[PDB]
């Protein structure tokens, strides 16, 4: 059918009614084929680094050049501040990838494949047009299925730029079928010895009633640096109706203390994360223009060469059935994929290959670990940056501060950490 028929179709109305009895498990939503995406959530990890030059720019900023790596302020006060600006522009540059790519490729946000446990998605940006970049590697692993959790690392050994993080959600519908989504997890970015802690924002999915879903961001994201500098980014959907969307204001502070007072911002950035934004130092200059720089997608090896744990190969028949809009064959291929994976895990275990906690481990940060649980080393980055920001260290929604209501709920404190050795010693998977 034409998208203009979607909203009043029997399938759509049937799906909307089924939401009334929503069990809280999104996996269950029996979404019609036309609103299904053939991309797994393990691929979404790639959206952290689709502008290789912006990902890597902080590593090129040093005591001896920083005033030459700060396009909107050649008079920036410090290399630390220049780097905070660049990491902020990078983080803004991810949002269009993360929150808009299905709209442009499929014509609307669609319901992604729920990843199997142990599912892997790997690739690299080889950065051939820029020798000084080197290859940047993405590893993405499905570390939990009940509930779904994706962990990931993106690293550039040449420039000592490395990213790790993990993600999970909780969602519920309101009466008009808006879907409120709270993200959980965080991502850490190290630029040589300097670190940055990033928290993803809450969001809501609009347009379900009309069968044309889309994301809009709300609340706040933070970027807290080991330098003490902090960026607080606030999202809003003001001006819908006037055709405005995807707005934000980001303010960078000397430290989290100054951040409790807006008038102390060293810079204020505002605009649209999916279009353009300006910056004003404590008149204005263009900070980022998402239309001027296309996304660059990572290199993924051919399907014929992929290991059967790899997302695209693994989801291949299911994807083909979705593309064909065949309810029958989608139900069949899915049941087949479950049998494949069940048998594959058996073989992995038979060869003594660990498939479960493949490249990431769950660390317990609660002051009551289970006897031999994995626990963080003493100068752990996460603890020190969470403390500078007064971030709760528990499994609260991303961005929860100490003493917020959500920080008060006997909540756990388990966080996923990448183990590089595990990739170096990886038994099967290559790029």
Ligand X SMILES: CC[C@H](C)CCC(=O)[C@@H](C)[C@H]1C(=O)C[C@H]2[C@@H]3CC=C4C[C@@H](O)CC[C@]4(C)[C@H]3CC[C@]12C
Query: Contact positions toward ligand X, by CB under 6 A?
Result: 26, 29, 31, 35, 41, 44, 47, 98-99, 109-112, 167, 169, 179, 181, 183, 205, 208, 213, 215
Q: How many whole angstroms separate alpha carbon 69 and alpha carbon 135?
A: 22
Least distance to ligand X, CB of residue 216, Å: 11
The rounded distance, in Å, linking the Cα atoms of 66 and 83 is 8
CB-nearer residue toward ligand X: 205 or 391: 205
Nearer to ligand X, 41 or 56 (CB): 41
CB of 262 to ligand X, least distance (A): 28
Nearer to ligand X, 204 or 281 (CB): 204
User: Does 301 appear as a known binding residue?
Assistant: no
The reply to whether 31 sits in an annotated binding site is yes
Q: Which is nearer to ligand X, 5 or 78 (CB)?
A: 5
**How many alpha carbons lie under 13 Å from residue 388 in its C-beta half-sphere?**
24
Least Cβ distance, residue 348 to ligand X (angstroms): 26
- The residue number with the shortest CB distance to ligand X is 111
Burial letters for 196-231: b for 16+ Cβ neighbours within 10 Å, e otherwise? bbbbbbbbbbbbbeebbbbbbbebbbbbbbbbebbb
Residue 46: Cβ-neighbour burial (10 angstroms; 0-12, 13-18, 19+): buried
Residue 186: CB minimum distance to ligand X, A = 11
Q: CA angle 307-309-313, nearest 5°? A: 65
Nearer to ligand X, 147 or 403 (CB): 147
- Which of 162, 154, 164, 138 has its CA nearest to residue 311? 138
Bridge-based pairing of strands 149-156 and 194-198 is unpaired
290 is in an annotated binding site: no
145 belongs to an annotated ligand binding site: yes
114 is in an annotated binding site: yes
Asked if residues 66 and 76 have their Cβ atoms less than 8 Å apart, the reply is yes
Which residue number, 44 or 155, has a Cβ lying nearer to ligand X?
44
Q: Which phi and psi angles does 53 have, rounded to 5°?
A: -60, -40
Tell whether residue 186 is among the known ligand binding residues.
no
111 annotated ligand binder: yes
Residue ranges for the known binding site for ergosterol are: 98
Give binding residues as ranges.
26-31, 98, 102, 111-114, 145-146, 334, 338, 342
Binding residues for cholesterol: 98
């Amino acid at each position: 059918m034409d998208p203009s028929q979607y909203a009043s179709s029997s399938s759509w109305t049937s799906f909307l009614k089924s939401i009334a009895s929503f069990n809280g498990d999104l996996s269950s939503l029996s979404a019609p084929p036309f609103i299904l995406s053939p991309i797994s959530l393990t691929e979404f990890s790639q959206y952290w680094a689709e502008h290789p030059e912006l990902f890597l720019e902080p590593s090129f900023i040093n005591d001896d050049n920083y005033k030459e790596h700060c396009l909107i302020d050649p008079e920036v006060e410090s290399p630390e501040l220049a780097r905070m600006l660049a990491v902020t522009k990078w983080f803004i540059s991810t949002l269009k990838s993360q929150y808009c790519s299905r709209n442009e490729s499929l014509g609307s946000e669609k319901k992604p494949l729920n990843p199997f446990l142990g599912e892997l998605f790997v690739g690299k940006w080889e950065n051939k047009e820029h020798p000084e970049f080197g290859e940047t590697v993405l590893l993405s692993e499905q570390v939990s299925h009940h509930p779904p959790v994706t962990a990931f690392s993106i690293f550039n050994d040449k420039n000592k730029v490395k990213l790790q993080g993990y993600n999970q959600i909780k969602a519920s519908f309101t009466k008009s079928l808006m879907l409120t989504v709270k993200q959980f997890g965080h991502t850490m970015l190290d630029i040589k010895d300097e670190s940055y802690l990033v928290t993803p924002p809450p969001l809501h999915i609009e347009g379900i009633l009309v069968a044309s879903p889309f994301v809009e961001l709300e609340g706040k994201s933070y970027i807290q640096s080991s330098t003490g500098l902090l960026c607080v980014i606030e999202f809003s959907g003001r001006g819908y109706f006037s055709g405005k969307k995807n707005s934000f204001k980001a303010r960078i502070y000397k430290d989290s203390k100054d951040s409790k007072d807006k008038e102390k911002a060293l810079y204020t950035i505002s605009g649209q994360w999916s279009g353009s934004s300006k910056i004003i130092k404590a008149e204005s200059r263009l900070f980022y223009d998402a239309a001027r720089i296309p996304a660059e997608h990572l290199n993924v090896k051919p399907l014929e060469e992929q290991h059967p744990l790899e997302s695209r190969k693994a989801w291949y028949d299911v994807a083909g059935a979705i593309k064909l809009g065949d309810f029958n064959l989608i139900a069949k291929t899915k049941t087949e994929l479950e049998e494949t994976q069940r048998e594959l895990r058996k073989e992995e275990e038979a060869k003594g290959i660990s498939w479960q906690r493949r490249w990431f481990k769950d660390f317990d940060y609660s002051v009551t670990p289970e006897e031999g649980a994995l626990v963080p080393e003493k100068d752990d980055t996460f603890l020190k940056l969470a403390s500078a920001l007064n971030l709760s260290t528990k499994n609260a929604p991303s961005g929860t501060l100490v003493g917020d209501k959500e920080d008060r709920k006997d909540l756990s404190s388990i966080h996923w950490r990448f183990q590089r050795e595990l990739w170096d010693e990886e038994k099967e998977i290559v790029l």
